[PDB]
């Protein structure tokens, strides 16, 4: 029995594409976040993440279904959420549903288009007292280090540059000696090459070799702990969790902590015609966050700069070298910038069954949130970077609130062979959002107890905003078996919110779904060995409501001008009258800042899909097999007013369609063997494909979804990238006129292919070179059982990616990026040389003669890979040892996470997942326990 | 079980304080200006007077006519407005609490919700709160493992009444009119005072409310390894969080203005408290001996912080524009944090034989984080006895007292309640953003440069507090001994209490020396003081052979506080006691010194044969020469007020006849002296730094020629005796009786409630503060609230109880 929506159904009548999770393992992956800890059990649900310790995470359910955001709507004990999940307890989970489909989603909303993941929490079972107590102390350890060239390979990049140019190497502006000559082959060789003693003429900065990446990074612990206490009578239940959850990145200060509580109760008095409940949760984060481009930076600064001046002050690139500022002192200035989250959650449903069968609801949420911090900046000081010595600090707060009240009241019979569930109700909501600000400047003494906004003495500001939102609907559902073989639901739910335009508040979405069994059918009885077979089928139609507030309203702003705009841009409205040329007293008025439609509208989805069940072999090999195909139809892009419209023109229209199908397979064979063992394999596989069917005007020209501002997107699929074609490289003579009028052509400088084939290296040669949307993406979960232990693995993969890889053009080129004498990567040292003409790395020149930044084939890889999630090997200790102590079951188990990977040949990289600059995947290992009284 | 309660009440203003009228203050007026013998035709305001003399020479009034605006053109009409009458309405209480309850062998479980809402008898000031409360445990294993968690949830919001809203009513004349003639607010105009009106100063601070969030709770875990012994560790968390705009609207009462200020102030605050304690307990019953110890832990923390943006000038003057983003001047950012902690080990020790004597022991070490480690801890202890007398035997031979218990206790208690920063020498930036009042910002920023300013000022810091190594704890110690008793088969009971409490090295913020200057307060530990008193509790309960029950019990006390030493400048302060012109070393905290006020000048005859008094003249206040040095001078002044009453008590009233029940809950305080300010306003024209004031209504019998009969002075125009002067005449008798709650009730008989599935089903209605004796020497309405604060209403309510 699950939940959908507002009702329980069986588990063998599901009609839409209920995929119901087993929660037995979201313990066992061992992390913060439960979605996070799902990331492939399930099929046609992409999620991307980091090692945030946070945790958070990315999530697509069916594949990209709209252009602008769409997360999807989770719902915790009734009330609904779109934002959080790691911070929420990931402990305290009964069943995690996930309602993939649009026609058994239809019910819970028109915000309902991404699907919902219906989460339930735990309760109290019948005549049990029983109390866990689980506990984890781990360790993350780093293991995708790219690699970067040192002092010494940094002075042989630079020679061999320049001796590529021919320019002399001495004269160059760092401080580095070259002792070098011609071979009789023509080709210039370096024969002794010396640095200096320090970095300027003043002896400020020493010279040595510093790991960057082993001096912003260490082996961070991960702590764990748990409780949980649960009751149970004839007349009332409870439960009653605890928490707490440490966690320290491996990039250093970072880190993350979560503290929970939780407690769950009802009560039923008079012969179950009166029951009051409540679920209620409360949590404290307190993250310190990774600042922006932190391993960017830590690839970028050359390693000749130290860590430490002369005297115990930072070092830096003092003179030549470019400005890139010291990623230790970033890390140690970003030390305290901590924020703090509380969060509270509500519940209290009061039930009432007037004769029989025939009950009653009223239940009434509460999101409360609020979230402090206190942002520093600091002066610093290393060689040519400083801030010109400017303190200040930012004491920012924000504020949330929701409240939802609804009140279903649901009818059930059951007459002849047939049976029937009607339910109608109403629902309400209100968001009230706030933040505001604070501002000071010139601080004295620099510390983080010191710098609160009264101890300052320069300028300050203020700011602050406030938002809104609201919602009324009405819905309804039915259900019908009339065999206990043709199964049949219908819904609709009339919905209007505050943000649609005046035209038309209350929206309707209807859905119709239908299914029917196989096996309970006579003439199918002489097949034995299947035991059950269930068709379904099902169309529905929802739409999502996450357009901006200000859609429909004409907003018109004052912007007296104390804001800052570089430029003297600054569209204000002062303007001095009376001729003063002084004082502060000026008039005011109101800029327009966009304009609004009167019929904006939801973004309707329509959503058919056709799926298969099976069971066979005396309850073995069961799965699915399930097909789908939806449409968009009206989704919303911002054009800019034309012309005579001026300032103020950007009117929100809706326009544009996507679709989406593919396949989804899901299996599993659980099977004891006479080997004295019992496994357990399931599996799943998915597919997909996307297109937009139509853009409405020049956003499709520009480029803002699809192609590079050179081809229209309409046809092809979303994010699709549009580019040159680079085949080889200039290795003969002859390929200067054996090639096509090319710009830039030298011995290195790929090549690229014609088109046209007319002497065409003009911009019209570029192809669809790269789509994101892979096939084939797939999982498998595998648990053995011998006496008395317990080992389960996982795989994930996905085979036939690309991606688009920008670390390669760090560690490709010599001169790519804007600023010169960058630190690179260590794969081009081995470059293309008149020595060594076996390699594909073009010539290490200093300057870009031939273009070599475009977007083109070169930076395409194949992004399919294959790796273990996580391995966990446990061990039960017997019966009569651990009933000696009072306590039902003990547990003493092991586990690690991210063990490995395998990749194709065709990557040239360290992490198959993020190439770019993410924060990393580090490797856990976990030596946990699970005492269970 | 469950209950559900639920009440609704109305709340009036009652002791309202009687206050001239337009017709009253020109007559008054009259009288002040001919007692002085000028014209009173030259009153600047709107009054003419057909006035003479009578045969024996003495000034009378005839007629008198009032011009019908305040002003030469016209914008504010006269009034007779009732000031107090427009700032008041009826409030309106609402109460409803649910609460259910469940109990299993294996443990119990409680669930509450409830709200109040109260508008306050002045106009734009209300209360309410929303409440939830979680409780539950649960006993495992067998019951040796205990787990439980008490926590409750609470959402407050308010308006509060601005400060001086009564002095400001008592004060604006009943001339200025609610309503200007325009339709803007009311306000002085021409001669009339600098008084704001009060109604509109009410409607400007009605959207001033805050909202409070406060979370309270524990949890706690309890293990029982063998019989008698019990370990237990107990986290306690609270924490509150406090969010506020409060607005700056432009005002312009006549000449009261504002300029065209308007601003707006978003405020947060967070207060974060968190306990945490382990306990270990013995306990051991051999036949006869019975006994308890008890050792532990505790560790405690509070981490305050505070923070809030201010921005003026808005463009709409609504609560819906005046956010800080809105803004087009000036914005100030303000804020700090603050805390301290406590480390805390004790133990406990309970001894009895043979159920007669009983032995106690206490003893704590107690550290904060308030003091430097040379001084962290302190150490406390505590020693109480206990004589069941009863049950010695020979005492048996008395049936008509059931038990008799004498007991007595020694002990100490320390107390570090005292700033965060209590030890240090604190100097602050402190650039001066802040609003002051007439200047004195005490701000480090300076145009030292001339050029007027346009831009940030060099600024520096300045010295708030000057630390001090060695403060150490405060050292409280209380001797106690009483008597418990029970006559007549428990009918009639009761309990005796003596004690003296002493509180040695005081932790006192002390001034600085006057040369020392800017921030030179340290705190020291310099100061001691007593009190003493009795305390009597006793309680009489029988029923009667015709249906009714009778329940009384009542209760009374007296003590005496002495400070017993005082750092020099804080007895010259005056800081706890004789006004700073003598030292309160030796009088009870808050005693004050001033003039004997002897009557009268009845007679020129009566200044001539008095000392030398600068001001006095017939008619003005005779004050008493004590050093009898032939001149009235500032020495002449003693100790004439004590707070302390002789005696206080209270007493409970309780009936029960024939399913109605009836309660009275009285309470008095007899002997008190109050100092009025009211009296200032009320028996004076110019007792008050600014003239033409609206004045009480008792002045209309100001002694003169022509009303010889009278204990108030002539009415004056100049404080020339400067009556002003702390004396005896604003001394009064502040004793009372005030029926605190009267409280009838009716619940419907079982049989009849039962029926509906109703264990208890009852009705009731009851008044709080609904009467007031006083004595007839006070000359104001409340003596409880002689002066300005918030009025205490009488409320009349009725309400219900439901339960299953």
Known sequence: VVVTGYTTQRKADLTGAVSVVKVDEIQKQGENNPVKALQGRVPGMNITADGNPSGSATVRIRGIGTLNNNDP???????????????????????????????????????????????????????QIKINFDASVSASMYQSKMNVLNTEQYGRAMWQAYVNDGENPNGNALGYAYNWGYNADGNPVLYGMT??????????????????????????????????????????????????????????????????????????????????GQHFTLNRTSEVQAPGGIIETALDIPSAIPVYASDGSWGGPVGGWPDRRNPRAVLEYNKDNRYTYWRMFGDAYVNLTPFKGFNLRSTFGLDYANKQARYFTYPYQEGTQTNNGKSAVEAKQEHWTKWMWNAIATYQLEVGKHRGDVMIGMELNREDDSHFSGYKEDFSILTPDYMWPDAGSGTAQAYGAGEGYSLVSFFGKMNYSYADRYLLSLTLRRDGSSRFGKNHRYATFPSVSLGWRITQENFMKELTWLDDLKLRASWGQT??????????????????????????????????????????????????????????????????????????????????????????????????????????????????????????????????????????????????????????????????????????????????????????????????????????????????????????????????????????????????????????????????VDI??????????????????????????????????????????????????????????????????????????????????????????????????????????????????????????????????
């Open 73 to 127: 709507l989770y719902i915790i004990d009734g009330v609904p959420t779109k934002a959080g999940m790691h911070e929420l307890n990931g402990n305290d989970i009964e069943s995690i549903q996930v309602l993939k489909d649009a026609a058994s989603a239809s019910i819970y909303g028109s915000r309902a288009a991404n699907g919902v993941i219906i989460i339930t929490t735990k309760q109290g079972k019948k005549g």
């Open 195 to 276: 640095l200096s003693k320090y970095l300027d003429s003043k002896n400020t900065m020493p010279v040595a070799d510093t790991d960057w990446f082993d001096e912003i990074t260490r082996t961070g612990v991960i702590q764990q702990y748990n409780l949980s206490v649960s009751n149970g009578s004839e007349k009332g239940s409870s439960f009653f969790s605890l928490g707490y959850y440490k966690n320290l990145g491996v990039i250093k200060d970072t880190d993350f902590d979560r503290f929970s509580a939780r407690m769950n109760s009802d009560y039923k008095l008079i012969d179950d015609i009166l029951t009051i």
């Open 543 to 800: 739409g999502n409501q996450e357009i901006s507030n200000l859609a429909r309203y004409t907003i018109y702003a004052p912007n007296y001008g104390t804001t800052d705009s570089f430029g003297g841009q600054s569209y204000g409205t002062a303007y001095d009258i009376t001729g003063s040329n002084g004082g502060g007293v000026l008039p005011s008025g109101f800029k327009r800042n966009q304009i609004g439609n009167d019929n904006i509208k939801w973004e309707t989805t329509t959503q058919t899909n056709v799926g298969i069940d099976f069971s066979l072999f005396k309850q073995s090999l069961y799965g699915s097999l399930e097909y789908y195909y939806k449409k968009a139809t009206d989704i919303l892009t911002e054009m800019a007013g034309v012309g005579v419209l001026g300032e103020g023109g950007s009117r929100w229209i809706n326009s544009g369609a996507m679709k989406n199908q593919g396949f989804e397979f899901n299996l599993g064979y659980r099977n004891k063997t006479a080997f004295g063992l019992t496994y357990d394999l399931n599996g799943n596989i998915s597919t997909y494909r996307n297109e937009i069917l139509e853009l409405p005007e020049t956003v499709a020209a520009n480029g803002k979804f699809g192609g590079n501002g050179v081809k229209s997107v309409v046809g092809h699929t979303y994010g699709a990238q549009v580019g040159y074609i680079a085949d080889g490289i200039f290795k003969s003579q002859d390929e200067v006129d054996n090639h096509a009028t090319q710009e830039g052509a030298a011995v290195g400088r790929i090549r690229y292919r014609d088109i046209d084939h007319n002497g065409v290296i003009d911009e019209r040669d570029q192809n669809w070179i790269y789509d994101p949307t892979p096939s084939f993406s797939y999982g498998l979960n595998i648990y053995l059982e011998y006496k008395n232990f317990d080992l389960t693995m996982f795989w994930q993969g996905v085979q036939g």
């Open 804 to 933: 688009i890889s920008d670390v390669k053009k760090k560690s490709d080129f010599w001169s790519a990026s804007n600023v010169g004498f960058l630190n690179k990567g260590t794969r081009l040292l081995n470059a293309w040389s008149p020595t060594n003409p076996n390699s594909d790395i073009p010539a290490l020149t200093r300057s870009d003669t031939n273009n070599e930044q475009r977007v083109s084939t070169y930076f395409v890889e194949n992004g399919s890979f294959l790796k273990l999630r996580n391995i966990q090997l446990g061990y039960t200790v017997p019966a009569v040892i651990s009933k000696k102590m009072r306590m039902d079951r003990l547990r003493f188990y092991c586990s690690a996470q991210n063990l490995l990977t395998i990749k194709s040949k065709n990557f040239t990289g360290e992490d198959p997942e993020n190439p770019n600059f993410s924060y990393p995947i580090p490797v856990n290992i976990t030596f946990g326990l699970n005492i269970g009284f």
